[PDB]
Amino acid sequence: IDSVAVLRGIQKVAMLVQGNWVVKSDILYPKDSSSPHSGVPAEVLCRGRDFVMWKFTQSRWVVRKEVATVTKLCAEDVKDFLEHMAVVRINKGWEFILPYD
Amino acid sequence: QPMIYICGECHTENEIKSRDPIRCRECGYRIMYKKRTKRLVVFDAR
Amino acid sequence: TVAVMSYSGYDIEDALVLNKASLDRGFGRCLVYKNAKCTLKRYTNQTFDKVMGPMLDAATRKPIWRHEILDADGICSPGEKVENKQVLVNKSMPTVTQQPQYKDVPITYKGATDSYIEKVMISSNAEDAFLIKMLLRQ
Amino acid sequence: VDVVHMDENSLEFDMVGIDAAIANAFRRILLAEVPTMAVEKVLVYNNTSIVQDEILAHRLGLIPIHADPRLFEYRNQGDEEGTEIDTLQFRLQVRCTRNPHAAKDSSDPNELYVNHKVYTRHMTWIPLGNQADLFPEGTIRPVHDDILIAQLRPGQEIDLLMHCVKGIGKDHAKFSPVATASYRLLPDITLLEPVEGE
Amino acid sequence: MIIPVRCFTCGKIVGNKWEAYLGLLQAEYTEGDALDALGLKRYCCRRMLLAHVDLIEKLLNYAPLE
Ligand SMILES: [Zn+2]
Ligand SMILES: [Zn+2]
């Protein structure tokens, strides 16, 4: 493969965070998608995801109990979105699933 | 004094009086539901 | 919560003893939903079924006992309890086999125990028939 | 009698010298024959919640009431109204609406709605006759202040009227004053030979 | 459909512990620790919260609304 020029393609679809790639927001949900789960429906708000992945860029992790009140949306959104990238440890949120390459 | 029905899709009062085909006045939805009565009912708490 | 023991002798062949203060607090509480539907068709002759209103008692200005729970449009209203042999739809069909004569064919609640009405559905097919469904709860 | 622990809504104590056939009698009286005040009649005006009216009446039956049952008498056979002497009367009336101001993302129900949870703090006591002066403010209430009853969506409405009366626990289990009342004999584990080492 | 007011076996008022149980699971307790922190000693009370399914939160999606 042309493994040097292709980064102007890959930059549009994935960005490197904590030594690893993380999927970009626009791949998963454009701005008219309905809630993917049962319970109370919710609207899409991609910066409500992007702020969470931003917090993983500055801090070590998301480290506090009640971020769902600060960002106002359902706990059933945040704890489901996180569950595709991480595993829980007691009280201190989630553990990043793969080592710091 | 008139009858008042509730639409099934949009929950709006329709007041079907004359012999018309059953149709919501606002949407196109064609199922109505009656309202709850105003008479009281008495239950046992058992 | 099950204790496995021989108690009171009413539990000999597969019978099992319950707790009276557990059934009162909500254990085993079920609901039974039934149905009662009625159609009102238009004939080839230009005549049609119809729902008369409640037939009043003139001395008391209240409806008769068989028509007690009916609303003003002849259909039983959601929220009220039905007893045995009360009507739910006050239907009348023509006896066309000059002015039309009607006979009564009411939809009555056959049933040994009482039932509460929860919702009454009114819709129409494309053949000008009116469809009426009731949901009954015990 | 040695009382070994007591606080709010709990008690532990010892009885020495009594036999099983009297301590068991005390346990059975505390379960089934000590009277309290609980809801029996629920009069319904416009229940539009998803909770069925029978199920709602059954849930409102089991809420404990802070009335002192030494002050009331038994309602007679029949007598479906009941007077100042032998009843109490609470009024639940909740209407659910939309919150007119919220965020645009608007996911949780706690920002979108108001009165969408019917707790038991929405019960308001209604006096009868002279009960306003026999009881000061606050002594006639439901106990727990947080019990979920129903749960609503905007447009739905709950309005009813309760009638608490006096009854014993042998009749129905919503009249039982205790969560659990029981006993055990006291152990005396004794050592037959001296146990040393590991 | 909804959390029962009392436990079926003994009679402890369980029905006010549900909104607190979900909040203690938002603070990332295990269930055996949250049920102990709420005050549920016996297992008959513990299975009221441990086995409950909250169907009314999902039945209210299909309810008619304004
Ligand atoms: Zn409509
Ligand atoms: Zn229990």
Side-chain angles (χ1 to χ4, degrees):
Chain A
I1 203 65
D2 306 331
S3 68
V4 54
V6 77
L7 286 310
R8 301 284 70 81
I10 306 310
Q11 178 65 42
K12 304 297 190 288
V13 297
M15 188 61 187
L16 72 171
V17 178
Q18 301 199 348
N20 292 285
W21 278 339
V22 180
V23 66
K24 290 289 295 294
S25 60
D26 194 22
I27 289 94
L28 301 184
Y29 294 108
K31 304 299 182 69
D32 62 351
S33 324
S34 109
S35 119
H37 64 5
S38 63
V40 173
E43 292 75 23
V44 64
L45 202 294
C46 299
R47 295 189 189 170
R49 285 184 74 243
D50 299 337
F51 181 81
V52 180
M53 272 67 83
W54 170 247
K55 288 291 289 184
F56 286 114
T57 300
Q58 288 297 111
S59 185
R60 73 287 295 159
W61 284 324
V62 178
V63 292
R64 292 181 182 175
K65 292 188 291 185
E66 190 50 37
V67 174
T69 291
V70 173
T71 58
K72 281 74 62 176
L73 79 170
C74 285
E76 295 77 24
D77 299 334
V78 174
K79 302 295 187 174
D80 187 24
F81 290 170
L82 266 290
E83 195 268 346
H84 296 76
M85 290 82 69
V87 62
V88 178
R89 63 178 185 174
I90 293 174
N91 302 126
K92 196 69 72 171
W94 294 83
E95 181 180 357
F96 193 70
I97 196 65
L98 74 175
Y100 185 73
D101 295 342
Chain B
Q1 284 75 241
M3 284 295 108
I4 288 96
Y5 297 111
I6 289 173
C7 179
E9 183 179 3
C10 64
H11 188 190
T12 58
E13 293 86 3
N14 291 112
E15 192 182 0
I16 296 167
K17 185 174 88 274
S18 297
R19 180 64 179 269
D20 291 331
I22 300 298
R23 183 183 292 274
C24 182
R25 188 262 306 160
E26 182 177 0
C27 295
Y29 197 70
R30 293 177 64 88
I31 295 171
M32 299 299 173
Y33 290 102
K34 289 185 68 66
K35 291 177 69 179
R36 187 176 175 85
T37 182
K38 293 181 181 180
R39 295 177 69 249
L40 84 160
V41 286
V42 172
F43 291 95
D44 284 331
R46 288 180 181 268
Chain C
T1 303
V2 173
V4 181
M5 62 187 286
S6 294
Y7 183 77
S8 71
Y10 293 33
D11 51 355
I12 299 298
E13 292 179 353
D14 293 331
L16 48 87
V17 180
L18 303 176
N19 201 171
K20 185 181 184 294
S22 293
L23 270 67
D24 290 332
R25 294 183 178 99
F27 183 78
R29 188 62 60 89
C30 65
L31 299 178
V32 175
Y33 289 90
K34 287 181 181 179
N35 196 0
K37 65 182 183 179
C38 178
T39 180
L40 299 175
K41 63 182 289 184
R42 182 180 291 272
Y43 297 99
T44 62
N45 187 5
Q46 295 301 108
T47 186
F48 54 90
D49 295 331
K50 69 186 292 183
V51 283
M52 292 300 291
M55 186 172 74
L56 279 77
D57 190 1
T60 64
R61 303 296 181 90
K62 292 184 289 294
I64 56 170
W65 180 78
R66 191 174 63 244
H67 294 181
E68 186 179 2
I69 61 167
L70 292 178
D71 201 357
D73 54 355
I75 304 169
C76 59
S77 178
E80 295 174 354
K81 68 189 291 292
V82 195
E83 294 177 354
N84 195 1
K85 295 186 263 75
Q86 292 185 359
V87 303
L88 300 177
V89 174
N90 195 1
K91 193 179 179 180
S92 297
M93 63 169 69
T95 174
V96 299
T97 67
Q98 191 270 330
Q99 292 85 19
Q101 189 59 255
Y102 293 109
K103 65 182 176 68
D104 289 332
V105 278
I107 307 300
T108 60
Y109 171 68
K110 285 91 171 65
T113 185
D114 296 334
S115 298
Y116 289 85
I117 302 168
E118 183 167 356
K119 65 179 70 176
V120 175
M121 190 273 287
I122 292 173
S123 179
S124 66
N125 292 321
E127 296 86 2
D128 291 331
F130 284 176
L131 180 64
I132 293 172
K133 288 186 180 181
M134 279 79 76
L135 184 63
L136 298 176
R137 184 186 65 241
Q138 300 183 1
Chain D
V1 173
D2 295 332
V3 175
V4 72
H5 188 274
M6 184 175 68
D7 57 354
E8 293 293 327
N9 295 320
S10 178
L11 177 60
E12 180 178 359
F13 65 102
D14 294 334
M15 292 176 69
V16 185
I18 205 68
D19 203 75
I22 300 171
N24 194 11
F26 292 158
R27 186 185 68 88
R28 291 169 66 88
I29 296 301
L30 283 172
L31 286 174
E33 288 290 327
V34 172
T36 55
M37 300 297 291
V39 179
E40 279 189 353
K41 299 295 183 182
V42 172
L43 286 76
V44 180
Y45 303 107
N46 192 4
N47 188 4
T48 323
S49 64
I50 291 299
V51 180
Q52 297 90 11
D53 303 335
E54 286 162 335
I55 303 299
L56 190 68
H58 175 264
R59 289 184 64 83
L60 288 173
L62 300 170
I63 294 173
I65 306 300
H66 200 280
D68 194 2
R70 275 86 54 86
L71 298 172
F72 295 94
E73 292 181 353
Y74 287 94
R75 179 177 286 172
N76 296 113
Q77 185 62 255
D79 195 2
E80 290 83 3
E81 181 179 1
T83 62
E84 188 268 332
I85 298 99
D86 54 357
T87 191
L88 290 177
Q89 183 169 356
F90 291 89
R91 189 263 303 162
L92 184 71
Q93 181 169 355
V94 176
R95 170 65 176 271
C96 183
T97 52
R98 291 185 185 274
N99 193 0
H101 58 87
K104 63 181 181 181
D105 54 357
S106 69
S107 176
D108 54 350
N110 296 115
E111 188 181 2
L112 284 171
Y113 312 119
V114 64
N115 289 319
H116 70 281
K117 292 182 182 292
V118 178
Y119 292 104
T120 185
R121 64 179 173 85
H122 297 166
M123 288 170 61
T124 302
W125 175 55
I126 296 297
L128 285 81
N130 297 115
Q131 285 179 353
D133 294 331
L134 184 61
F135 300 103
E137 291 86 4
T139 59
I140 304 299
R141 67 183 186 271
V143 179
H144 285 285
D145 206 5
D146 283 327
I147 298 168
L148 187 68
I149 300 168
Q151 188 171 1
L152 297 172
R153 285 291 184 266
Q156 295 177 355
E157 197 266 329
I158 291 170
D159 192 1
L160 51 86
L161 184 68
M162 290 167 277
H163 282 162
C164 305
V165 294
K166 188 179 180 181
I168 63 171
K170 181 182 278 185
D171 181 72
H172 191 277
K174 68 192 174 184
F175 294 104
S176 68
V178 295
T180 179
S182 71
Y183 59 93
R184 67 183 190 273
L185 278 65
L186 178 133
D188 49 353
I189 298 98
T190 182
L191 299 177
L192 296 177
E193 293 180 354
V195 175
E196 296 177 353
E198 293 294 327
Chain E
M1 185 181 290
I2 199 169
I3 185 73
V5 176
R6 294 174 183 266
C7 176
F8 293 155
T9 291
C10 63
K12 186 177 179 65
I13 292 93
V14 182
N16 60 357
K17 306 291 194 293
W18 175 251
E19 294 290 331
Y21 178 76
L22 287 176
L24 266 69
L25 267 71
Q26 293 300 320
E28 298 297 327
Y29 290 165
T30 61
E31 295 87 2
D33 294 330
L35 292 172
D36 289 335
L38 289 174
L40 300 178
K41 300 284 102 176
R42 301 180 298 274
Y43 56 88
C44 68
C45 294
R46 291 169 71 99
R47 68 182 171 89
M48 289 297 163
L49 296 175
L50 189 64
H52 179 266
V53 292
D54 196 0
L55 288 179
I56 197 164
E57 187 69 28
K58 292 177 285 295
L59 287 172
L60 283 172
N61 293 321
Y62 298 7
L65 83 167
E66 190 269 329

